[PDB]
Amino acid sequence: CHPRLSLHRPALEDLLLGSEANLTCTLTGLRDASGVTFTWTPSSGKSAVQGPPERDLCGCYSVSSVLPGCAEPWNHGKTFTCTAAYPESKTPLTATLSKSGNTFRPEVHLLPPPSEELALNELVTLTCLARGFSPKDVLVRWLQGSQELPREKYLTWASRQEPSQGTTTFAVTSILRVAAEDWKKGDTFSCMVGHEALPLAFTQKTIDR
Amino acid sequence: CHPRLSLHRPALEDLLLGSEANLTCTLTGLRDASGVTFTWTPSSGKSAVQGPPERDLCGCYSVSSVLPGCAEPWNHGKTFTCTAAYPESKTPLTATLSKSGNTFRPEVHLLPPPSEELALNELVTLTCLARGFSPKDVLVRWLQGSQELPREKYLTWASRQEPSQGTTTFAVTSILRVAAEDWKKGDTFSCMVGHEALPLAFTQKTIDR
């Protein structure tokens, strides 16, 4: 089927919370005998690693390549390029990605548990709001006092573009259900949002009765 | 490629807010010469309508069929069936759908504009929360006084399953940015949520300074 090639930016969690944030360039659609190649513009010790010829829809056997360490050039603003060389053609496909522009710092909010909820003394809800920010990419984490909770304990939606004239900005919400006794006792809670635009990568925000 | 067949329930908006809510049965994957057929279990004047052989990924030319009026049998609890008959096989594929079970009524919340927002006297935010409900399907609409606003004026995320032991329940949030002057003046606002489980199909909830 129709061969294609794309560059995947370094996952924001990997950048702000991971060890070695990679950057991928995957050649999707090489429906034929694979033996592909790759070429990166900024190649500096970053010995691109290739993988096994995975399969896609009905046969679009795809192949990837990963560039390690790119975390430095990436935030710097450099622009990574990648050209693949498969047999089903006489021309090397190419892709180019670079950190996004027109960045907009997020505006975080910590909405208190619904008055009607805190009265059924059981499970109250804290809502987090990351509104109007630069690119879609965003991290939302929660703190119980000073301890981060398991990503598994809360629910966070995906970044959605919002109704707006002129500028393209996104939003995100997170729902942390907490044990009423805690909110009542005084236990504090915080919503930490991570974003490409924030200078200090994160923005905290705490609330308590 | 691999031929398949599925039944699509009657869109919740069409049921609660539309004229004639259909129910679709689409045969995806008939990668060959089409001339398909269809068969519904409850056929009562519901003269199923077929459409043009659309195309999918690389060639999975798909064909559909629509059953009108099914809105009655559907909420009743009946179970619709559909069997397609294409040439690439000697056996008619079949699909079966029925209104979901284990229904859970939603719990709606109208969170007040963030205190820090209502002070920059410009655009404040109202947050709606539909939490722990029966099936994913849900409608969120907004009211300014007594007038519904354009779906286009607010932002509503998708229904997400939430962190929960035992029972599978979903959540949904909606963000309505409003003109501060209004909230201040006293203008009232409401979040109306529609759900298969609610007896009166909708649940209102209003709030104002």
UniProtKB/Swiss-Prot annotation, chains A, B:
Q: List the disulfide bonds.
A: 1-58, 25-82, 128-191
Q: Which residues are glycosylated?
A: 22
Q: Would the keyword Transmembrane turn up in this protein's UniProt record?
A: yes
* PTM statement from Swiss-Prot or TrEMBL: N- and O-glycosylated. N-glycan at Asn-22: Hex5HexNAc4.
**Keyword Transport belongs to the record:** no
Protein keywords? Adaptive immunity, Cell membrane, Chromophore, Chromosomal rearrangement, Disulfide bond, Glycoprotein, Immunity, Immunoglobulin, Immunoglobulin domain, Membrane, Secreted, Transmembrane, Transmembrane helix
Any single GO BP term:
antibacterial humoral response
Q: Ig-like domain location, by residue?
A: 3-98, 106-208
> What the protein does?
Constant region of immunoglobulin heavy chains. Immunoglobulins, also known as antibodies, are membrane-bound or secreted glycoproteins produced by B lymphocytes. In the recognition phase of humoral immunity, the membrane-bound immunoglobulins serve as receptors which, upon binding of a specific antigen, trigger the clonal expansion and differentiation of B lymphocytes into immunoglobulins-secreting plasma cells. Secreted immunoglobulins mediate the effector phase of humoral immunity, which results in the elimination of bound antigens.
Q: How does it assemble?
A: Immunoglobulins are composed of two identical heavy chains and two identical light chains; disulfide-linked. Monomeric or polymeric. Part of the secretory IgA (sIgA) complex that consists of two, four or five IgA monomers, and two additional non-Ig polypeptides, namely the JCHAIN and the secretory component (the proteolytic product of PIGR).
What is this protein identified as? Immunoglobulin heavy constant alpha 1
Organism field: Homo sapiens (Human)
Task: Give the source lineage, highest ranks first.
Answer: Eukaryota, Metazoa, Chordata, Craniata, Vertebrata
Q: Which gene encodes it?
A: IGHA1
